[PDB]
């Protein structure tokens, strides 16, 4: 159930943070 | 299959060298009278640099070469291998030095 | 959008500024120096490093990347190796021009022939356009056949 | 004497003419034989000696005193080109035509350490037992590398494994055996190899090879001295300027200054201009030999070792102890103490992590049997994974 | 197994003087050419103005 | 003429001379040798100087060369800047068997032939210089 | 090794030719750098000029 | 032990002409022929082993410790064979881990 | 669409068209290169977000482009040939 | 006696009526494919200067 | 050569041993086993080569 | 060191956001997109002075793709160490190969080798710290240190520092 999103504006670990896929909803 | 004569630097067969000596070293050191190990160790096949001599006494490489005394031939700029230590001292006894054509010795 | 992202800012060419390479740049934009005349290592892949076909020069293989950039064959433009010359050559495309400098200058004290005290010479001088500067003085300079170690007072000159 | 016999003007001349590749012994030998065949006759072939060297490719060197007869040795011959390819060879030149070659060594010493050259032990270290007087070959001392029934890795000949899986060992000697035809002298392989074999200069050594080769000697590394000799090889040649590099000088009337690299020509002329407290002095470029220079690290660089097991590693300078020099490391962020030669001031890294490992970066790896997690910067020696 | 065909070559005669004006800028005013060649093997040899 | 010159070549003698015992001095003072290196632009610029060979060679301004080139007893090699600009000076004059007479220079020419702390291109100019002066003596 | 003048000049003039032919193979005056075919080379002053070149 | 062992460098010298399906094979022969010694192998490897639920809240050195302790307890419990350790390193592993030994 | 046809479409005045036909119809690049030395000689990384001109020893000064493939080949080949174009974003006078 | 049968093969092969390493300056063009696409065509080209 | 030409070109050239000593001296200085300089210090300490390793194998207690 | 600097930025903007709300959008995203960032150039953007009233002139439409591109000049407030400056610091981390602190929002990390060896360090201590007979310095400490080298990284900066010195240590 873990999804890893990349963002270019977030700087830590280069963009990159663990979201569950439970918390997210399609763009 | 040739061999350069370390001594006076003159070129021949190994079998040359061990059946009849060498024409000029024969006078100290006696190749044709001495056995396979001593004839390599005063001829190399190992060499250099092949040189023709035709009139050692004008030819200004022959006194470059200290062999305008020599018979004329084929002859080695460079030789691999030196005299060993005690043909060097039997050489010393006649009373001649042996100046090397290893060209490391200058 | 058809290029992959990147942080630099996106600006376009406003001025080509020409000239030419230092040694000393051409051996700082290097990657890699060129020794090697075998274009392969053994005929078993992996090109010698080294050689004419080093990886890090760049990559011309789909499964291949680059060794310095790290970038795909779609975005990696290719890095320059300089090879250190054993004795100085003429550039081909220059000779008449190295000829005509040495025409114009001293080949042992390395100074110009005339000087602005001379009126031509001052007047030449005083243009603008360098290759307009360079013929007019070239073709004063070109009749002074001497160095002169005195002043025509010491000019700087050899004799 | 050897200084006298220089030549002179009034010495015959000598003459290069060009000649088909690979045929300048055999026209020596035919100008050598007419010359014998016309000695003794109404017309001699006039010209006093005739040579060719190995370097000077195509290239035949015959020593006389007249043009024509050196048309009279070469008329006849086929491997003359057609053109008369001759030139009068300057009496400078004299000397240099016969100088000796390859006198950097005096030969091959017993017991140095040398690097083969090919065959199985192709690159294994190995001690030169003996020197062969011919000097084409020469035993050696090596490790074996045996399977006892693509190579077996160098391990010590070991009796016992060898008898139970080939019982069919010689002896000849206590302490020396001979196994499958190769001899073994106390659990150290004793073989010839040919010259065309071997490495006698630039030789790396490895302190694993030397240590199982001096093991047997009773002491750990007990002989130095080549050993040395390879480290000034290494320091020597391992130096590399760039201009702007703080350098300090060694030798000449100028030891002991600091200056800073200006520009570099060729790899030997280094252009330097001198710091002191006089300005008139800090003005001046002074072109100084770079064999004479040393590197000058001050603390709080960003320096990148250059060669090593911490090769692309790249830190902060902390402490100078003279010839090592000690730095904080940027992947590790541990202290490394490397020798000053191994350091090169960079003052950015941008390493490349490509052709390492087995992972690269956004890679999804598994840490555990638990724990799974994602690469989100490599290392050359590591690699930081989020979970 | 490709079929070629020999294309006929167009060439002056030889053995013929002839005569032609060169132009202005030239010491030249009036050429006369003649291109030899042996009747055994019709080759060309060489030819003299 | 002549003679202005000869007294400026003196001049730069003296001058040469009096560079050479100051770092000389400050070597064995505990400081570099600086002076040799600010006379060496003057120095150059006369000796490349093609006229003023003739009086150059009246003058035997070679001795100051020579003991320029001569080694400091602290065994330490003058700057390598001097030997090559007094190497090329060297070259470009036509030295005969009488200044090398007066100068002695072929000492210090052998010397820089025999070492090995001197440059290998110096090593053989050296070499061809010293086959050149020898030329003359033997024909 | 060893510095015979006129090889030195042989070998430093090869080198120069071959630099030269590299950029530019249509020097008036000398043979052309041919290739095992023939062919001449093709430098790059040749990529660049004509309907073919790099410009056109 | 296994699939660490497929990808030590360990294997790749001991075997150099080999697959890696086979590396892995040898690894699995070897843990079911000696445990200990297998583990023994692993060297620094060992302790990226999930050993406990939480094993990650110790600090590094303390984990270390207690690997250390664990090892030379069983090891002792076990004990070595000095002569096949000298006559083969892969029992030689176990030498440093006795009691009053160490490296 | 060769010279005639740009010289054509020049007439018209439609530059847009012009751009869009030898560039994004064609071989369209991206490069970078140093503010400083103008080169095309910086070293990027695009995924691990760091550019670096060795020569200038710069990290932050760096542009992109977006030029003919045709003419990073032409600007290497002179470069090859010891000519050293410079690139600029800004005008100097 | 490869010599004359790979000469003649490759001038009337290629055109270039000439050795094959001096094929450059060679007059070039002198054999063609035969045109088969009719049989006037074919005709015409057999007889063509 | 002749003899008194033979004594010119010493006086030109010199024997040498206005500058022997010089050489002697530089021959000296061009001749000179401290493992630290023979290999890096990570390498030593990871093949056990320092002198913490001699005192711990010295030592009579349990590393 | 703080600083007042005079600095510019170039933001684009979609045609999406092509509204009479267009320049007050644009201040909050400079705000957001510049506020607390690290340029390894300039070092830490802290704030930004008058923020809500900033120029940004008029936007170019870029061609061929619509966006516009806005040119805002601003003036922000900097902070930027420097190699050999001393400055004022508070512990974070005690470790056996040194101990952290921060200088707002540097953290700088002091090795041993760069630290006076009476202070030894103590992991018996609690909590653990770098003690001398009349020094402890431990987590939260006053530590007034002197900064030797600086590392760049994307959008990071890497201090350390040392105590080496007189007047330096614990404060
Ligand atoms: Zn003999
Ligand atoms: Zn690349
Ligand atoms: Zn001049
Ligand atoms: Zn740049």
Same mark, same amino acid.
């Given at each position: 159930?873990?999804?890893?999103?990349?963002?270019?504006?977030?700087?830590?670990?280069?963009?990159?943070?663990?979201?569950?896929?439970?918390?997210?909803?399609?763009? | 299959?040739?061999?350069?004569?370390?001594?006076?630097?003159?070129?021949?067969?190994?079998?040359?060298?061990?059946?009849?000596?060498?024409?000029?070293?024969?006078?100290?050191?006696?190749?044709?009278?001495?056995?396979?190990?001593?004839?390599?160790?005063?001829?190399?096949?190992?060499?250099?640099?092949?040189?023709?001599?035709?009139?050692?006494?004008?030819?200004?490489?022959?006194?470059?070469?200290?062999?305008?005394?020599?018979?004329?031939?084929?002859?080695?700029?460079?030789?691999?291998?030196?005299?060993?230590?005690?043909?060097?001292?039997?050489?010393?006894?006649?009373?001649?030095?042996?100046?090397?054509?290893?060209?490391?010795?200058? | 959008?058809?290029?992959? @992202?990147?942080?630099?800012?996106?600006?376009?060419?406003?001025?080509?500024?020409?000239?030419?390479?230092?040694?000393?740049?051409?051996?700082?934009?290097?990657?890699?120096?060129?020794? @090697?005349?075998?274009?392969?290592?053994?005929?078993?892949?992996?090109?010698?490093?080294?050689?004419?076909?080093?990886?890090?020069?760049?990559?011309?293989?789909?499964?291949?990347?680059?060794?310095?950039?790290?970038?795909?064959?779609?975005?990696?433009?290719?890095?320059?190796?300089?090879?250190?010359?054993?004795?100085?050559?003429?550039?081909?495309?220059?000779?008449?021009?190295?000829?005509?400098?040495?025409?114009?200058?001293?080949?042992?004290?390395?100074?110009?022939?005339?000087?602005?005290?001379?009126?031509?010479?001052?007047?030449?001088?005083?243009?603008?356009?360098?290759?307009?500067?360079?013929?007019?003085?070239?073709?004063?300079?070109?009749?002074?056949?001497?160095?002169?170690?005195?002043?025509?007072?010491?000019?700087?000159?050899?004799? | 004497?050897?200084?006298?016999?220089?030549?002179?003007?009034?010495?015959?001349?000598?003459?290069?003419?060009?000649?088909?590749?690979?045929?300048?012994?055999?026209?020596?030998?035919?100008?050598?034989?007419?010359?014998?065949?016309?000695?003794?006759?109404?017309?001699?072939?006039?010209?006093?000696?005739?040579?060719?060297?190995?370097?000077?490719?195509?290239?035949?060197?015959?020593?006389?005193?007249?043009?024509?007869?050196?048309?009279?040795?070469?008329?006849?011959?086929?491997?003359?080109?057609?053109?008369?390819?001759?030139?009068?060879?300057?009496?400078?030149?004299?000397?240099?035509?016969?100088?000796?070659?390859?006198?950097?060594?005096?030969?091959?010493?017993?017991?140095?350490?040398?690097?083969?050259?090919?065959?199985?032990?192709?690159?294994?270290?190995?001690?030169?037992?003996?020197?062969?007087?011919?000097?084409?070959?020469?035993?050696?001392?090596?490790?074996?590398?045996?399977?006892?029934?693509?190579?077996?890795?160098?391990?010590?000949?070991?009796?016992?494994?060898?008898?139970?899986?080939?019982?069919?060992?010689?002896?000849?000697?206590?302490?020396?055996?001979?196994?499958?035809?190769?001899?073994?002298?106390?659990?150290?392989?004793?073989?010839?190899?040919?010259?065309?074999?071997?490495?006698?200069?630039?030789?790396?050594?490895?302190?694993?090879?030397?240590?199982?080769?001096?093991?047997?000697?009773?002491?750990?590394?007990?002989?130095?001295?080549?050993?040395?000799?390879?480290?000034?090889?290494?320091?020597?040649?391992?130096?590399?300027?760039?201009?702007?590099?703080?350098?300090?000088?060694?030798?000449?009337?100028?030891?002991?200054?600091?200056?800073?690299?200006?520009?570099?020509?060729?790899?030997?002329?280094?252009?330097?201009?001198?710091?002191?407290?006089?300005?008139?002095?800090?003005?001046?470029?002074?072109?100084?030999?770079?064999?004479?220079?040393?590197?000058?690290?001050?603390?709080?660089?960003?320096?990148?070792?250059?060669?090593?097991?911490?090769?692309?590693?790249?830190?902060?300078?902390?402490?100078?102890?003279?010839?090592?020099?000690?730095?904080?490391?940027?992947?590790?962020?541990?202290?490394?103490?490397?020798?000053?030669?191994?350091?090169?001031?960079?003052?950015?890294?941008?390493?490349?992590?490509?052709?390492?490992?087995?992972?690269?970066?956004?890679?999804?790896?598994?840490?555990?049997?638990?724990?799974?997690?994602?690469?989100?910067?490599?290392?050359?020696?590591?690699?930081?994974?989020?979970? | 197994?490709?079929?070629?065909?020999?294309?006929?070559?167009?060439?002056?005669?030889?053995?013929?003087?002839?005569?032609?004006?060169?132009?202005?800028?030239?010491?030249?005013?009036?050429?006369?050419?003649?291109?030899?060649?042996?009747?055994?093997?019709?080759?060309?040899?060489?030819?003299?103005? | 003429?002549?003679?202005?010159?000869?007294?400026?070549?003196?001049?730069?003698?003296?001058?040469?001379?009096?560079?050479?015992?100051?770092?000389?001095?400050?070597?064995?003072?505990?400081?570099?040798?600086?002076?040799?290196?600010?006379?060496?632009?003057?120095?150059?610029?006369?000796?490349?100087?093609?006229?003023?060979?003739?009086?150059?060679?009246?003058?035997?301004?070679?001795?100051?060369?020579?003991?320029?080139?001569?080694?400091?007893?602290?065994?330490?090699?003058?700057?390598?800047?001097?030997?090559?600009?007094?190497?090329?000076?060297?070259?470009?004059?036509?030295?005969?068997?009488?200044?090398?007479?007066?100068?002695?220079?072929?000492?210090?020419?052998?010397?820089?032939?025999?070492?090995?702390?001197?440059?290998?291109?110096?090593?053989?100019?050296?070499?061809?210089?010293?086959?050149?002066?020898?030329?003359?003596?033997?024909? | 090794?060893?510095?015979?003048?006129?090889?030195?000049?042989?070998?430093?003039?090869?080198?120069?030719?071959?630099?030269?032919?590299?950029?530019?193979?249509?020097?008036?005056?000398?043979?052309?750098?041919?290739?095992?075919?023939?062919?001449?080379?093709?430098?790059?002053?040749?990529?660049?000029?004509?309907?073919?070149?790099?410009?056109? | 032990?296994?699939?660490?062992?497929?990808?030590?460098?360990?294997?790749?010298?001991?075997?150099?002409?080999?697959?890696?399906?086979?590396?892995?094979?040898?690894?699995?022969?070897?843990?079911?022929?000696?445990?200990?010694?297998?583990?023994?192998?692993?060297?620094?490897?060992?302790?990226?082993?999930?050993?406990?639920?939480?094993?990650?809240?110790?600090?590094?050195?303390?984990?270390?410790?207690?690997?250390?302790?664990?090892?030379?307890?069983?090891?002792?419990?076990?004990?070595?064979?000095?002569?096949?350790?000298?006559?083969?390193?892969?029992?030689?592993?176990?030498?440093?881990?006795?009691?009053?030994?160490?490296? | 669409?060769?010279?005639?046809?740009?010289?054509?479409?020049?007439?018209?005045?439609?530059?847009?068209?012009?751009?869009?036909?030898?560039?994004?119809?064609?071989?369209?690049?991206?490069?970078?290169?140093?503010?400083?030395?103008?080169?095309?000689?910086?070293?990027?990384?695009?995924?691990?977000?760091?550019?670096?001109?060795?020569?200038?020893?710069?990290?932050?000064?760096?542009?992109?482009?977006?030029?003919?493939?045709?003419?990073?080949?032409?600007?290497?080949?002179?470069?090859?040939?010891?000519?050293?174009?410079?690139?600029?974003?800004?005008?100097?006078? | 006696?490869?010599?004359?049968?790979?000469?003649?093969?490759?001038?009337?092969?290629?055109?270039?009526?000439?050795?094959?390493?001096?094929?450059?300056?060679?007059?070039?063009?002198?054999?063609?494919?035969?045109?088969?696409?009719?049989?006037?065509?074919?005709?015409?080209?057999?007889?063509?200067? | 050569?002749?003899?008194?030409?033979?004594?010119?070109?010493?006086?030109?050239?010199?024997?040498?041993?206005?500058?022997?000593?010089?050489?002697?001296?530089?021959?000296?200085?061009?001749?000179?086993?401290?493992?630290?300089?023979?290999?890096?210090?990570?390498?030593?300490?990871?093949?056990?080569?320092?002198?913490?390793?001699?005192?711990?194998?010295?030592?009579?207690?349990?590393? | 060191?703080?600083?007042?600097?005079?600095?510019?930025?170039?933001?684009?903007?979609?045609?999406?956001?092509?509204?009479?709300?267009?320049?007050?959008?644009?201040?909050?995203?400079?705000?957001?997109?510049?506020?607390?960032?690290?340029?390894?150039?300039?070092?830490?953007?802290?704030?930004?002075?008058?923020?809500?009233?900033?120029?940004?002139?008029?936007?170019?439409?870029?061609?061929?793709?619509?966006?516009?591109?806005?040119?805002?000049?601003?003036?922000?407030?900097?902070?930027?160490?420097?190699?050999?400056?001393?400055?004022?610091?508070?512990?974070?981390?005690?470790?056996?190969?040194?101990?952290?602190?921060?200088?707002?929002?540097?953290?700088?990390?002091?090795?041993?080798?760069?630290?006076?060896?009476?202070?030894?360090?103590?992991?018996?201590?609690?909590?653990?710290?770098?003690?001398?007979?009349?020094?402890?310095?431990?987590?939260?400490?006053?530590?007034?240190?002197?900064?030797?080298?600086?590392?760049?990284?994307?959008?990071?900066?890497?201090?350390?520092?040392?105590?080496?010195?007189?007047?330096?240590?614990?404060?």
């Amino acid at each position: 159930n873990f999804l890893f999103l990349r963002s270019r504006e977030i700087v830590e670990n280069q963009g990159v943070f663990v979201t569950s896929s439970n918390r997210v909803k399609t763009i | 299959r040739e061999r350069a004569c370390m001594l006076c630097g003159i070129v021949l067969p190994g079998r040359v060298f061990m059946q009849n000596g060498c024409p000029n070293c024969d006078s100290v050191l006696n190749l044709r009278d001495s056995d396979q190990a001593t004839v390599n160790e005063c001829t190399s096949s190992s060499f250099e640099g092949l040189v023709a001599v035709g009139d050692n006494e004008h030819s200004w490489v022959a006194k470059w070469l200290r062999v305008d005394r020599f018979q004329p031939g084929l002859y080695a700029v460079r030789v691999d291998g030196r005299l060993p230590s005690d043909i060097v001292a039997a050489l010393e006894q006649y009373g001649v030095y042996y100046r090397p054509r290893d060209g490391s010795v200058i | 959008s058809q290029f992959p @992202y990147s942080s630099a800012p996106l600006r376009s060419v406003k001025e080509v500024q020409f000239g030419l390479l230092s040694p000393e740049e051409i051996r700082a934009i290097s990657v890699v120096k060129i020794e @090697y005349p075998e274009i392969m290592d053994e005929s078993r892949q992996r090109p010698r490093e080294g050689g004419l076909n080093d990886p890090k020069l760049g990559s011309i293989d789909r499964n291949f990347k680059c060794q310095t950039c790290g970038e795909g064959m779609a975005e990696c433009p290719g890095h320059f190796g300089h090879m250190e010359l054993a004795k100085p050559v003429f550039h081909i495309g220059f000779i008449p021009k190295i000829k005509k400098v040495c025409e114009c200058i001293c080949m042992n004290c390395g100074k110009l022939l005339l000087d602005e005290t001379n009126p031509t010479m001052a007047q030449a001088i005083r243009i603008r356009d360098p290759k307009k500067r360079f013929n007019a003085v070239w073709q004063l300079c070109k009749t002074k056949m001497v160095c002169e170690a005195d002043a025509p007072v010491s000019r700087g000159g050899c004799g | 004497p050897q200084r006298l016999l220089i030549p002179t003007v009034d010495d015959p001349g000598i003459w290069g003419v060009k000649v088909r590749l690979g045929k300048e012994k055999d026209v020596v030998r035919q100008i050598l034989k007419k010359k014998l065949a016309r000695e003794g006759t109404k017309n001699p072939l006039e010209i006093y000696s005739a040579f060719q060297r190995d370097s000077f490719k195509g290239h035949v060197y015959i020593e006389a005193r007249k043009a024509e007869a050196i048309n009279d040795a070469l008329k006849g011959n086929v491997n003359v080109f057609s053109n008369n390819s001759k030139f009068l060879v300057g009496i400078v030149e004299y000397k240099d035509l016969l100088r000796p070659v390859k006198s950097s060594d005096v030969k091959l010493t017993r017991g140095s350490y040398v690097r083969v050259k090919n065959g199985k032990f192709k690159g294994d270290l190995a001690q030169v037992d003996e020197v062969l007087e011919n000097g084409l070959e020469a035993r050696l001392k090596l490790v074996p590398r045996l399977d006892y029934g693509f190579r077996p890795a160098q391990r010590l000949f070991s009796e016992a494994e060898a008898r139970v899986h080939e019982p069919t060992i010689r002896r000849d000697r206590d302490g020396f055996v001979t196994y499958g035809g190769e001899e073994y002298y106390e659990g150290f392989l004793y073989k010839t190899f040919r010259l065309q074999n071997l490495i006698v200069n630039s030789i790396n050594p490895t302190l694993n090879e030397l240590s199982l080769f001096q093991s047997n000697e009773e002491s750990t590394t007990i002989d130095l001295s080549t050993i040395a000799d390879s480290l000034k090889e290494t320091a020597k040649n391992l130096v590399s300027f760039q201009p702007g590099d703080n350098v300090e000088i060694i030798n000449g009337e100028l030891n002991h200054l600091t200056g800073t690299v200006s520009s570099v020509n060729q790899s030997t002329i280094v252009s330097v201009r001198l710091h002191s407290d006089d300005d008139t002095i800090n003005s001046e470029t002074v072109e100084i030999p770079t064999s004479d220079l040393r590197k000058i690290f001050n603390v709080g660089d960003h320096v990148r070792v250059i060669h090593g097991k911490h090769t692309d590693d790249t830190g902060l300078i902390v402490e100078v102890n003279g010839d090592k020099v000690e730095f904080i490391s940027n992947q590790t962020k541990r202290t490394v103490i490397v020798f000053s030669n191994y350091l090169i001031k960079s003052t950015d890294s941008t390493v490349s992590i490509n052709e390492s490992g087995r992972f690269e970066l956004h890679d999804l790896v598994q840490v555990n049997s638990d724990l799974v997690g994602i690469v989100i910067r490599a290392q050359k020696d590591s690699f930081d994974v989020l979970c | 197994g490709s079929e070629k065909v020999l294309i006929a070559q167009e060439r002056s005669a030889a053995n013929i003087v002839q005569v032609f004006k060169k132009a202005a800028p030239s010491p030249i005013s009036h050429v006369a050419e003649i291109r030899s060649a042996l009747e055994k093997g019709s080759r060309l040899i060489s030819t003299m103005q | 003429l002549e003679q202005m010159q000869d007294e400026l070549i003196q001049q730069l003698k003296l001058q040469m001379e009096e560079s050479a015992i100051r770092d000389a001095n400050n070597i064995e003072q505990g400081k570099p040798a600086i002076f040799k290196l600010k006379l060496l632009p003057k120095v150059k610029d006369i000796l490349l100087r093609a006229n003023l060979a003739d009086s150059i060679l009246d003058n035997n301004l070679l001795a100051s060369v020579r003991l320029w080139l001569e080694p400091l007893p602290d065994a330490s090699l003058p700057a390598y800047q001097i030997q090559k600009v007094l190497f090329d000076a060297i070259k470009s004059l036509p030295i005969k068997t009488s200044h090398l007479r007066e100068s002695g220079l072929g000492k210090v020419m052998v010397f820089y032939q025999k070492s090995k702390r001197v440059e290998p291109n110096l090593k053989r100019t050296a070499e061809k210089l010293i086959s050149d002066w020898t030329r003359p003596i033997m024909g | 090794d060893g510095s015979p003048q006129h090889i030195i000049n042989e070998v430093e003039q090869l080198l120069q030719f071959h630099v030269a032919t590299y950029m530019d193979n249509d020097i008036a005056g000398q043979p052309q750098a041919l290739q095992k075919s023939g062919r001449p080379v093709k430098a790059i002053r040749a990529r660049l000029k004509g309907k073919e070149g790099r410009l056109r | 032990t296994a699939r660490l062992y497929q990808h030590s460098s360990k294997s790749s010298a001991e075997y150099p002409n080999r697959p890696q399906l086979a590396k892995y094979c040898i690894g699995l022969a070897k843990y079911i022929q000696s445990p200990l010694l297998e583990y023994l192998a692993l060297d620094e490897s060992m302790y990226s082993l999930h050993i406990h639920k939480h094993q990650n809240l110790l600090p590094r050195e303390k984990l270390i410790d207690a690997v250390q302790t664990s090892i030379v307890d069983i090891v002792n419990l076990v004990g070595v064979d000095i002569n096949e350790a000298v006559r083969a390193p892969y029992h030689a592993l176990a030498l440093p881990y006795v009691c009053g030994l160490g490296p | 669409f060769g010279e005639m046809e740009r010289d054509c479409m020049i007439a018209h005045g439609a530059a847009g068209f012009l751009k869009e036909r030898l560039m994004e119809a064609s071989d369209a690049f991206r490069v970078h290169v140093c503010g400083i030395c103008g080169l095309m000689s910086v070293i990027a990384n695009l995924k691990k977000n760091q550019f670096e001109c060795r020569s200038c020893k710069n990290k932050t000064n760096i542009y992109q482009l977006h030029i003919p493939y045709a003419a990073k080949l032409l600007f290497q080949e002179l470069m090859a040939m010891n000519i050293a174009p410079r690139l600029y974003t800004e005008r100097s006078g | 006696s490869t010599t004359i049968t790979s000469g003649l093969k490759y001038s009337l092969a290629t055109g270039n009526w000439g050795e094959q390493k001096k094929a450059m300056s060679s007059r070039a063009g002198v054999s063609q494919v035969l045109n088969r696409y009719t049989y006037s065509s074919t005709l015409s080209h057999l007889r063509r200067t | 050569l002749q003899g008194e030409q033979y004594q010119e070109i010493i006086e030109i050239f010199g024997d040498g041993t206005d500058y022997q000593w010089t050489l002697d001296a530089e021959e000296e200085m061009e001749q000179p086993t401290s493992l630290a300089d023979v290999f890096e210090p990570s390498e030593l300490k990871e093949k056990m080569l320092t002198d913490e390793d001699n005192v711990i194998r010295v030592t009579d207690l349990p590393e | 060191m703080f600083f007042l600097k005079d600095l510019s930025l170039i933001l684009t903007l979609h045609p999406s956001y092509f509204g009479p709300q267009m320049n007050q959008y644009l201040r909050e995203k400079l705000l957001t997109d510049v506020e607390g960032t690290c340029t390894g150039q300039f070092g830490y953007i802290v704030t930004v002075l008058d923020g809500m009233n900033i120029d940004v002139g008029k936007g170019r439409i870029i061609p061929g793709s619509g966006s516009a591109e806005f040119e805002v000049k601003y003036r922000a407030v900097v902070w930027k160490p420097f190699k050999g400056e001393v400055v004022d610091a508070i512990v974070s981390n005690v470790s056996p190969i040194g101990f952290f602190a921060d200088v707002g929002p540097l953290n700088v990390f002091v090795s041993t080798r760069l630290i006076p060896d009476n202070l030894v360090y103590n992991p018996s201590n609690s909590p653990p710290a770098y003690m001398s007979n009349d020094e402890l310095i431990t987590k939260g400490s006053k530590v007034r240190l002197k900064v030797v080298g600086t590392r760049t990284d994307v959008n990071e900066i890497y201090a350390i520092g040392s105590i080496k010195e007189d007047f330096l240590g614990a404060i």
